[PDB]
Design a protein around this ligand. Structure first.
Ligand SMILES: Cc1cc(N)c2ccccc2[n+]1CCCCCCCCCC[n+]1c(C)cc(N)c2ccccc21
Lengths: 186, 177
């Protein structure tokens, strides 16, 4: 459990102090491990952080599997996912370390390579909703990959660039977007 | 205006946090006291750039005959400009790493950003292209959705991005009518 202890501790350090401030020395000593083991498993602070994000994305997917039973039809699932995306981000503790992380390794094509495989996972959630929505005549989309990328990124924008407003208004808007968007697929 | 140019460049190349008071003065070659907050300098640049965009938009919107077309175009152009949108990641940090006199003050910057759509949508209501009772909501949603597509895909074929943005604009408008 040394690999999973290191990630657990590193998660909490990144949460408490951000990405740049947290050193690998800290993570080593606090998880009772060695620079060696940390190097053998993750090679860099950068890659360790990506691995956390993998664990976190998996937990999110696992969360979404349970939570999407409260949505009988894919139209309902679309509405719900976008809400969840907005509401849960408001108190996602890693979010700040993520902002800090991305806005620092976006240029390195390899790190930006793995960060894309990660967003692709977020985009898969919509892809499913839309594919299944087709197979139940909720709508007709011949370009599911496209409309999926659009939804994911439209929704991130509404989640990220609003913040200023109070949480009720932000939920109203998000749901209004969800409405407008699904109406344009008809 | 010796500072502001290098600050922009620095803020765009590296983060809001990563670029510094020292780095700004030393790289621009100017007096430390001369520029005496960082948040004040930042909010200044955002205003400048946001104006340079809305100005460029006015000298370019003429090529769209109907407001339906203005929507598509403004959004398409949002991908190509050198103004404002290249500072979006820097703004994301800004909110996290930042009060009262500033955090409420830069909602006047947001309303300027949203106003572009407010015209387009209000104009379209006069022109009878659609009917939006909740213009202001739709404007805020439009602005942010688009900013999303612009910002969270800045690492892929620019011509693909323009395709996505157009498939977006279509859907959004189709859902208004
Ligand atoms: C657990 C968990 C819990 C949640 N409530 C949650 C909520 C929403 C999404 C994931 C969530 N997860 C899953 C967490 C996984 C996060 C993985 C995202 C890594 C890529 C970063 C996204 N990103 C991209 C793409 C492009 C950018 N320009 C950019 C700029 C600034 C900041 C981010 C940027």
């Amino acid at each position: 459990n040394l690999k999973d202890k290191i990630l657990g501790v590193a998660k909490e350090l990144f949460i408490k102090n951000g990405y740049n401030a947290t050193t690998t020395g800290e993570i080593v000593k606090l998880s009772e491990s060695s620079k060696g083991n940390l190097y053998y498993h993750f090679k860099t602070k950068e890659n360790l952080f990506l691995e956390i994000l993998n664990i976190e994305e998996s937990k999110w997917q696992e969360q979404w599997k349970k939570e999407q039973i409260k949505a009988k039809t894919n139209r309902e699932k679309f509405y719900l996912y976008n809400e969840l995306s907005l509401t849960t981000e408001y108190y996602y503790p890693l979010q700040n370390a993520i902002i800090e992380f991305y806005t620092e390794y976006y240029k390195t094509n390899s790190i930006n390579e793995k960060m894309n495989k990660l967003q692709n996972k977020y985009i898969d959630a919509y892809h499913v909703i839309f594919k299944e929505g087709n197979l139940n005549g909720e709508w007709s989309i011949n370009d599911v990959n496209a409309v999926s990328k659009i939804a994911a990124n439209a929704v991130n924008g509404i989640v990220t660039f609003t913040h200023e407003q109070n949480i009720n208004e932000r939920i109203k808007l998000m749901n209004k977007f969800s409405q407008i968007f699904l109406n344009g697929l008809s």
